[PDB]
Each structure stands twice: as structure tokens, then as C-alpha cells.
């Protein structure tokens, strides 16, 4: 059945695969290695934006943040362009989600504040959503680099799916902040070959990707059927057998998502 198909994918890509889809009214949870830890990688940037939105009035989005050359320490497609003028919190949220901008994420962590450059407050935000599993310990670029099996900077497919469910479908955020988060994920530019690739075109998909060392490739999404029925989909993977420089393999996530879509159709 579905477990056999996911195991086939692990052998095909020399990978470890984790999948979680929470249960709904009529569908049982889909779970494969769903309680094993995988690195967040950039998937943490979605709940990070939620944390910053929740913490501040909505007009905080218009506050200008300045930064300089020594702040660009990671893949930062937007922040590298605006370094000469600064970026507002809103622009930083946009870039962190839609371009997985690492400098934007680091600046948003600092905006959250507190110990660990904001990582402790980020973890505390997850705890307030009932997530007792996930932990963020470093910022960019280091959070992509922990050795396989190390629990620093990890979540699980199960844990991050339940967090995303509350943020997008539940009441963790007031409606106006919920809509900002949802719209940024809906306009993501980095996810076309992951969960989006597994679902038919008449399904709506919003997502946040993650990519890291040891062949790490993640995607977390909310999808809506053509009749508006929502599902949360978390897919996580690594290829530790190839070492630090193992290539991430997006097609693994597209195939896993195709399997999931077949069950939810």
C-alpha cells in the first residue's frame, strides 16, 4: 500500500522520507516516519513570519530595517538587492517566505528578540501552539548543517503539520494576519517542483520549502480540493548516505506528493 510506495521512493533516491497529512472529517491521517526528526531547513520561515505577525500590531509591517554587508551570510535573493536602502518588516516577511531569504529570516529572528538571536522566542512560539517537539537552535546558515540524527534545528512531519494547520486553517492568528501569511505562501516562488507538482492544477497549493545539506529537501503545504476542502501536507527528506554534499532531490517530494494526492482525490 502507501507505506510500500514510500519505501520504494526511499530506495529510488537513497533517501529517508517523512510524510504527514493530519486526519480530516473523512480521511485518516497519512503518516510515514512522521514522528522522526528532520531538519527544519527553511520551512521554519513560515512559522517565523507567523510569530512576528502575532507579536506586533499589523502596522509593524511598515517599520524599516537597515542592515549591512556582514549581515548577508546565506542565500538571500532579495536582501542582497536592497542592502543599500533597507527593507521593511513586511518586505522581510515576503522575502523570507517567497524567496526563502536567509538574511530576511535572520533579521526577523532579531526582531522577535531574546536569547539566541531570537531562536528561543521562535521555539517558544511553537510551544504556545502545543508543539513540544520542534526546536530552533541556530540561525542561517548554520541551521541547515547539523549532522544527520542531531536534534538541533529539527521538527517532525507530524509536528510541523499540526503547527501549519493552526496557522492557516485554525485560529492561531487573527483573520487579517492569517490572510497575510496565507497569501505569501500562496505566492511562493520556490515550490513548483515539490508538493505543487504532485497535485492536479485545479487544487490550490500554498507552501514553504526547505533545502539544506546532507541532501535535505522539505516542503510544507496547505492544499484545497476543487470544492474547497483543505488538507495539510508535510514532506521531509534527507540523503545522509551521500554525506554533507549529497544533492537534494526535489523529485522525491513530487512523487511522494503524487501518492498523497491520489489518496485525497
Numbering used by the authors: 29 to 293
From the reporting publication:
BlaC is a class A β-lactamase and due to its broad substrate specificity towards β-lactams, β-lactam antibiotics alone are not an efficacious treatment course for TB infections. BlaC, a hydrolase (EC 3.5.2.6), cleaves lactam carbon–nitrogen amide bonds rapidly, effectively deactivating β-lactam antibiotics. As previously reported for BlaC and other class A serine β-lactamases such as TEM-1, SHV-1, and the CTXMs, the global fold consists of two domains, the α-domain and the α/β-domain. Located in the α-domain, adjacent to the α/β-domain, are the catalytic residues Ser-70, Lys-73 and Glu-166 (numbered according to Ambler notation).
Herein, we provide crystal structure evidence to demonstrate that the serine β-lactamase BlaC can be phosphorylated at its nucleophilic serine by the novel β-lactamase inhibitors based on a bis(benzoyl) phosphate scaffold. In the case of the phosphoserine crystal, Ser-70 showed clear density for a phosphoserine having been phosphorylated by the inhibitor bis(benzoyl) phosphate. The phosphoserine structure resolved to 1.52 Å. The phosphoserine crystal was in the P212121 space group. Additionally, the phosphoserine BlaC structure contained phosphate molecules near the active site adjacent to the nucleophilic Ser-70. In the phosphoserine structure, the distance between the oxygen atom of the phosphorylated Ser-70 and the phosphorus atom of the closest phosphate molecule was 4.5 Å (phosphate pictured above Ser-70 in Figure 3B). In addition, even though the previously published BlaC structures contain phosphate molecules near the active site, they do not have a phosphorylated Ser-70. Consistent with the proposed phosphorylation mechanism, we did not observe an intact inhibitor, nor released benzoates in the active site after the phosphorylation step occurred. A plausible reason why the bis(benzoyl) phosphate scaffold worked over other organophosphate scaffolds might involve the electrophilic nature of the phosphorus center and the pKa of the leaving groups’ conjugate acids (e.g., benzoic acids vs. alcohols and thiols). This new crystal-structure evidence suggests the inactivation mechanism of BlaC involves the unsubstituted bis(benzoyl) phosphate via nucleophilic Ser-70 phosphorylation, and is expected to aid in the design of future novel β-lactamase inactivators utilizing a phosphorylating scaffold.
